[PDB]
Write a new protein. Sequence first.
Lengths: 470, 498, 49, 163
Amino acid sequence: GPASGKIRAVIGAVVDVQFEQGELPAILNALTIDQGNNQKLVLEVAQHLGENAVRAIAMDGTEGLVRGQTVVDTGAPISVPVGRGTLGRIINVVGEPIDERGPIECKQRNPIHADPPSFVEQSTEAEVLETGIKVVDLLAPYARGGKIGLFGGAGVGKTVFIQELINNIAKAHGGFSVFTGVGERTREGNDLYREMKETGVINLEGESKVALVFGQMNEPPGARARVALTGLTIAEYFRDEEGQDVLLFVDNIFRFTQAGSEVSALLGRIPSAVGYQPTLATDMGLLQERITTTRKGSVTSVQAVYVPADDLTDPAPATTFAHLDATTVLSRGISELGIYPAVDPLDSKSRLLDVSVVGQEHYDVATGVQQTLQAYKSLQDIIAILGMDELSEQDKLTVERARKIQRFLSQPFAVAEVFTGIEGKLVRLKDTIASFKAVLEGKYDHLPENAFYMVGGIEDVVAKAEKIAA
Amino acid sequence: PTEVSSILESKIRGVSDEANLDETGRVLSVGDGIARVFGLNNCQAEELVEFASGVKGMALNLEPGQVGIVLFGSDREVKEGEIVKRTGKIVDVPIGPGMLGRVVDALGNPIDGKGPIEATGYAIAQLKAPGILPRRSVFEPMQTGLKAVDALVPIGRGQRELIIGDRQTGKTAVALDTILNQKRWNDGNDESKKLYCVYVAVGQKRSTVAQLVQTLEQNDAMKYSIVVAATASEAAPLQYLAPFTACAIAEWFRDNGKHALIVYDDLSKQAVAYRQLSLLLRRPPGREAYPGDVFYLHSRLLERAAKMSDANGGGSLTALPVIETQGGDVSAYIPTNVISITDGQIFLEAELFYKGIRPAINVGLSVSRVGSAAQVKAMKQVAGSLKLFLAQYREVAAFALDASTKQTLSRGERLTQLLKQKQYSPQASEEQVPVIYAGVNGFLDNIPIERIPEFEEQFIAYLKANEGDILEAIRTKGELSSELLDKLKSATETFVAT
Amino acid sequence: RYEAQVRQHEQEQLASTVISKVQSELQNAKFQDKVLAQAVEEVERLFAK
Amino acid sequence: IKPPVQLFGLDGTYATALFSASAKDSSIEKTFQSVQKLSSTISKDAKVAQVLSNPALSLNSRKEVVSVLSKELKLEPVVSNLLTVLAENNRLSLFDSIAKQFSVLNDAYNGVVEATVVSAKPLDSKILNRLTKSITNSKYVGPGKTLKASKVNKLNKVLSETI
Ligand SMILES: Nc1ncnc2c1ncn2[C@@H]1O[C@H](COP(=O)(O)OP(=O)(O)O)[C@@H](O)[C@H]1O
Ligand SMILES: Nc1ncnc2c1ncn2[C@@H]1O[C@H](COP(=O)(O)OP(=O)(O)O)[C@@H](O)[C@H]1O
Ligand SMILES: [Mg+2]
Ligand SMILES: [Mg+2]
């Protein structure tokens, strides 16, 4: 027989299990509870209160459990299916399929709780990844095999930025994908599975190359915090045991830290800053270090962070900026003007923005475009109060070039064709560097400011100015 | 009829026959909306309880030797040493088709004096939302009646459209006009076009809930609409559970083959009631004195209002949450949590509401995610680039005489005045398609600015007697081809010159 | 409205007189109420055994 | 050995911890009479209760020095170890809670309760409570029962609220 326990306390997601025998369960142990729906339950051990009693965290709803229920221990952690059998199926936090397509016939089942890579097994690189956007291929360029962060507020453009990059980079990457959504919406999960099947990403009757992991905000706090560990276990097996460049897509990454803060008050831990948990830097660093590039394979992490009430100085937004190679902050002020998207050039930064990786031509164009936008933003107090006529001769030419350069970097994505009405433009890396250098030298000063808004490179800006003047 | 009091006394004589089997025990302490009950070993988590005076309770935390019961009433109905009573079930409420036409409360009891409610079942308040296999895309159109809501950010069956804004701006007025405009489809025989309203007044006053129910009954709109009364004079547990109880009653129609429309007015009042019970239980306060589970309470109740597929019945549930902003602060803790879970929002600015633009719907802030495909084809074809032309005309008029700027200012002023309707004056899809086609084609530029209200009433009355074939074809078919577009342009040009 | 108010006032006045007569009968040492209360407790415990 | 009686968890764990070591070699009957003598000579006496509320003492009359407060009273077996643990942990103020929890363990495994109405029940010591409650309710209703209630008050309040 296995190790059976008795439920002694139950307050929300926390359920203290009192074991009658001396062989108590360890930390991060999967506990099963018998119910009456052919599904049982799932519970993960957190800490031990003593006196033959350990406080566990349930991964589902604890409504209906009485004092003294049987809680059997599985002897290990929450295992999930890994390998090629998880491609195309919708798995959950416990590894069970939710796509109504039978069980996942996997050979091995790895646990969700595992250690990350050491210092001798790491592998750093400097390979640039072309995304197609004009504001991302010149300002903050992404790195292949690193961690990308798409920070932003509510209604800025966090969900649309991850969908446009997956339809132009993950479709021709060669390796398998891993779209593990944590804290998403109910309508976002059904719309992402139907769009990938019609484009050739998730084939139900053929070969697939994208792992889907369920876990929206409609579940409890235990399923949302454990959704990031289940999706990362399937992507780590394809890069270590198989050696493939996996692509981890988390939406959103801020839901992992917010789910653990609601259950930290019932476990005995004291509150931290802004009512958060005390182990904020320890829980976020254990999961972000395992989604890196090793010597056996790479892992391009493309997660998205959510700003709390439009604040970048929070405990869940500032702690995730030190574990990402490239950041993409989305300000709420530029989204109401007409920028698609609201890519802030003064806040987005990356480690690949140098002259030794992008060349001497791309490094000079990035420094010149950022210097013109910083001069116009610092002088905004005089243009909004006194007006634009209070400037001199040198400040008047810099204000006109800064407005046209900000609208030229906002290109219309292919996924946002129903909200904008224009077609999708995918500018290359060589075409975006040549168009920004010609506008800053004085070759496009006679054109209007509306000819570069929602366009492509230098070819689309000349065709839009001739049609508006006819 | 022939001594009606004798029939109720004979049926209520024998009922209490088996109610002495231990079950719950007694209590120990009570205070701050809680009751520390000592005992009840067979009571499950989140189960309904009953005190000795008749007050209901909910056992939240159950530790060893004690059980934290949250009272849903006043603290004067529970004392030290009083016996409790376990119900045996969880926090459920009544649902079914018999609740249409009565004003219920938070626990499902009637407060209108119409007697008992003929419920067909019992659904729990804390129900899980559907997955990605039992959901479908929003394709049905939800007519609200307003000309500035049906053409800009339209709503659909199964989507969640928020209604942010400040006080006295048009938050509660937008939800009342959409429920009264469904009388043209619910009074007929089309069951797929009908939509049952579900007004959940949480946080409102006692006099405001009684005046709103009397206005809907006089216009034949309270016969198929559920009213959830939840004033601020009750306990903190009754107002916080008003959102979960109202969603369980409206979910029965979506799971059988009907459409539902829930209006949670307001979303800001429900967040203040949930924080009062958590602060008294010694919890951790985060931003704006809120607990860690503040975002999970609003995201779980809004995820259940989705559109089912054809294998689940084909129904849908619409959610209309009203957010009360404090001075237009849309970047707050309760403002950013409701906008990140809903598919679109309707911002109500207080600057345009005091100038006469009713309702003040900002074109540059309010948008709809699943509103383009879930709209009528006749209204979308006549309003070509209506959302893009309305946002660009407001920015050019605030900074202003050239030749190009004079054409956009004259056309933008006539379209904003014609789309502004009065209170309790909803229009259909056929009448709003003829008024929006004249302002976008240049047929209303020759009229004056003060004659914008007179031109809308004259064009609607002349198109229902001299051209009845064009108005009936736009509502039955829902689109306009080549023959329907040429007949509408000839009738609008001849009536504008006379 | 006058007919409904007269019917509600007559039903409320008749219910108040019947409630006062039931309370006065129990305070007059009713021998039948004491014997019926003890026999109902023994029959209810035997049905659940 | 832990019996299924719960009895709180923190304050009620004082008597439950000492009941495991005292339930060996038949040492449970002598603990009932010895616990009643310690509470009857510190409550209705007003002589030895001078250090019941004061926080002084600190090993002066509580432990060590006893003689007449242990040997002359009714303590010789495991009764002296129960008072020494409450003096070092500052638990001598709640002597009535430790003695009341010891009598509830013997009345649960070797007796019964479940009071119906009026006064107390019968508290049988047979086996199950199904055949013991039916044979004791008929013999107690006829003998005595002055009836000087709960079921008559609940039925009268339901008829007046529906008027
Ligand atoms: N390239 C774009 N062009 C126009 N609108 C966009 C673009 N990208 C995003 N949006 C708008 O931003 C909104 C984002 O909504 P949502 O995903 O709910 O919030 P968040 O992006 O904060 O998660 C969408 O309604 C969409 O209309
Ligand atoms: N179409 C309209 N025409 C005229 N007045 C309106 C219109 N819509 C709303 N109002 C006014 O706006 C007010 C809104 O009041 P209330 O609902 O209490 O505040 P809120 O709308 O912020 O919830 C009403 O008193 C009503 O007179
Ligand atoms: Mg999103
Ligand atoms: Mg209102």
